[PDB]
Amino acid sequence: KYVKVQDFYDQLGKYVLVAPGKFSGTVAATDLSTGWTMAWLAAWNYGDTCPIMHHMAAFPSPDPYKEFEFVVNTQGGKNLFIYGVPVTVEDPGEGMKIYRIKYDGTRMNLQRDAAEVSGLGLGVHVTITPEADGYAVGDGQKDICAEFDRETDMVRYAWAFDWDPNVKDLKRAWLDGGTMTIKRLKPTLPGGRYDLQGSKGNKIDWELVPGGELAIEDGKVSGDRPLHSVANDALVFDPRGKWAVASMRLPGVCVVFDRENQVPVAVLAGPKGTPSQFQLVKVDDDTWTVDIPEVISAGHQAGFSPDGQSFLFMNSLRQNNIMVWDSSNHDDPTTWEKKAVVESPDWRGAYPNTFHMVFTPDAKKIYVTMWWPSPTPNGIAVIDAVNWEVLKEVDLGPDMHTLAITYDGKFVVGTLSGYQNTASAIVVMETETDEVLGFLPSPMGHHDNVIVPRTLEDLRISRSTTT
Amino acid sequence: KYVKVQDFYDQLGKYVLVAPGKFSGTVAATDLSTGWTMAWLAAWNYGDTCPIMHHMAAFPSPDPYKEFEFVVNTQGGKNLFIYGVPVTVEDPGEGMKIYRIKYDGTRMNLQRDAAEVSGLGLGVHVTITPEADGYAVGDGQKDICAEFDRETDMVRYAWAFDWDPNVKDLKRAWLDGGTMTIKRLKPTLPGGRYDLQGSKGNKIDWELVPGGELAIEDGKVSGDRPLHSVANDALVFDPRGKWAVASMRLPGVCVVFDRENQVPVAVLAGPKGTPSQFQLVKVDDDTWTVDIPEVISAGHQAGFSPDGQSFLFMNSLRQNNIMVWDSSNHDDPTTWEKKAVVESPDWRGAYPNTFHMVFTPDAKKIYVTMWWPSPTPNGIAVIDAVNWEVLKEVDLGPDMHTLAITYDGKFVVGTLSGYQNTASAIVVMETETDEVLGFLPSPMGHHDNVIVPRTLEDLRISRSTTT
Lengths: 467, 467
Ligand SMILES: [Cu+2]
Ligand SMILES: [Cu+2]
Ligand SMILES: [Cu+2]
Ligand SMILES: [Cu+2]
Ligand SMILES: [Cu+2]
Ligand SMILES: [Cu+2]
Ligand SMILES: [Cu+2]
Ligand SMILES: [Cu+2]
Ligand SMILES: [Cu+2]
Ligand SMILES: [Cu+2]
Ligand SMILES: [Cu+2]
Ligand SMILES: [Cu+2]
Hints:
The PDB classes it as oxidoreductase. The entry lists the keywords Thioalkalivibrio paradoxus, thiocyanate dehydrogenase, copper, oxidoreductase. 2 copies of one chain form a homodimer. The first copy, chain A, has one domain. Chain A contains 3 helices and 32 strands. Chain A is 3% helix and 43% strand. The first copy, chain A, has helices spanning 5-10, 114-118, 456-459; strands spanning 16-20, 26-31, 37-42, 52-58, 68-75, 95-103, 108-113, 126-128, 134-139, 144-149, 155-165, 178-185, 232-237, 243-248, 253-258, 263-269, 277-278, 280-284, 287-292, 298-304, 310-316, 321-326, 337-342, 353-359, 365-371, 378-384, 389-397, 400-405, 411-417, 424-430, 436-441, 450-451. Chain A is mainly beta. The complex binds copper (II) ion (12 copies). One copper (II) ion binds at residues 225, 227-228 of chain B.
């Protein structure tokens, strides 16, 4: 007579979902085989006075139910004021913490703040290296990305990015083009430490919010140096090793870095109607520039296919599409050429934006969230990643963020986050016939989620290769 | 082929679950008809520096999906240090806030702190009056309970309780008996306000935790006046009106109050081996005493059946049972006589404790949580509330707290809370054949939960009549 929710979980397999909660100040692991929260952690318990829990990634574990480690970062200061919540803390903590947490099979344990260890505080995307020997973080207020060692939490390399606009007016600073500088960042304090915790290095006093990139042109984003912003977002990894790609939202480019030799090698041009690449110019052993005649569109989410054959960059607002490069030539990224653009006649307005992504293990399909401001339903576009065409779009609810996939490829698990004030949930979609199976409660404002990987192979479709 | 979790929710009906998160610092409403979190609120966003979100109760709403109001309180100070979390907060807030929150069909809105309005801060059970015209709060650190007006958030009446032990040694202070004073508590500040916000009035510097009543005897609970503690817990309401009952954990008694005439009328004696009642002695128009020769056992949870015919008090630790009075005589509580004791040969050790409860609408069954410290599975006892016998016990998981019931009587919805550091969930049990249907994720340390009532009749099986 009665339906058991246990029958629903039985089909999903033995997979652990982990997500941060943005304004909730919390992070939580969920057993998809039972519906239990396995453990949660509230950063306010550790004296965090602005625990905006932002991005996260989990290292592979041979058995996540026995133990797994993850990295979750924070934002602070005026980031607290930019969602609909009538917050009262006029002078919050500066955030940019990089927390190391271990689930030990019973509880979450706060290990340390890697920003205190390294001296480098960064507040946007967190990714695991394909070797699971380290992690990377980007930041779009200070325009810095870095790869960190997993054992020591020390910086392996850090890059700072700067914009020199052709026209010194916020309305024209990106549209009329300019020169981006790529600068090696070296430690300045004893013990190989940086002096870049909290708000140190901020060019703008809050993040460019989802869909909000062009507010900076209209003078709506306060800061020391907004004319010089590029809004770095992430450093994603080629699953084949060697390369990391830094995404720059405002100039609409991605920079390909040699991880081992610690140099940039290529600049990918995001907008449809631009060449495959812009020319990287070496100035000195620590300094490169790239000239961009005009920025046709901002961009945001970025990722590799799990076989490394495709590199994707999402153009936003001025164009809404997925730009696709042929990255098949692992030896030389300067050869990576545009091969496709995913477009839809249904992507008509400034919104929706092509947003977060996850590939199937075989790289034949990609799931991409479609983001709108309140109250238009957000949802998932199902994309044929062989012919680069939209198969299907499904309406789900408010403020959709990240997608993960069970490592058998069977279920996509996504987050909806209520713009930090309304309805939020986990969504489950089966990948065989792309039906939405329904929602699980999730009282959190997640801008990220992962399924805990078991193998290095699993990482190729987790928070390593894509945002 | 694939199971849709929407099929599970379809059977539950149009019911709204609400729960506070204790150490999570959050509160959340869940749509049981879809699995969505409807809205959540993080008290740190409103300058709360110790948001231990403790107890809560919701007022009836003709349509909870359009709007509902609820009350949720907080605990603070050294309460932060008594769970397994290795907390690091140098200057925790004092808590004892009484938040008024309104869900407006989109978001939760913080209305005000009733403790600031009234001047009276209380941190344990919150209950709605059976008229839905007010609410009550108890506190076991200050030993005060009060009924508040819904419109003004001002105190209607407040009672302070004090213990005078026969033996001035914490080991013997309750076992060897004493005299409890019941004192009318009057305001001291302009506008009829109390001076009892935050830690003001604390006799002990932290709560007696679930199953932890004994710690005070062993000198393990610091405070100004622990020898004078009674650990008031709740003020529950007779669904027929007129009477409110204050539960006292340490002396093992409940005090019946005349709400309108603002006087105590009866003292119910909890332990098996005590009479139905102890003698209430009037000292003056503001002061009553009751002599207790020996406290045989502490007690905790308390409640009326929905028809008001039965009153229940749970004896804990020294005895684990449910003491049941015949409360059928609404005109004169001094006539209420013991009529049953729910006992089990399995309840003969210190644990499990008979814990929180919910009745079926027809009062024929009661569901009672059975609490153990880690790692013994906690669960639900299903009780025949006509013959007062245990029908069934089911093992569920760690740290079980409250139960609510859908107002059609079909589904019991309970919370498990991981001792603030491990596994947590919502559990759903169908009441027809008492099968556990399974769990929903809940990344929260809930010591409470409600289903939003629609009618005054619904309140009879919500957070009004019982804890
Ligand atoms: Cu982000
Ligand atoms: Cu300038
Ligand atoms: Cu991003
Ligand atoms: Cu190669
Ligand atoms: Cu997102
Ligand atoms: Cu974000
Ligand atoms: Cu309680
Ligand atoms: Cu004394
Ligand atoms: Cu209680
Ligand atoms: Cu009567
Ligand atoms: Cu409880
Ligand atoms: Cu409690």
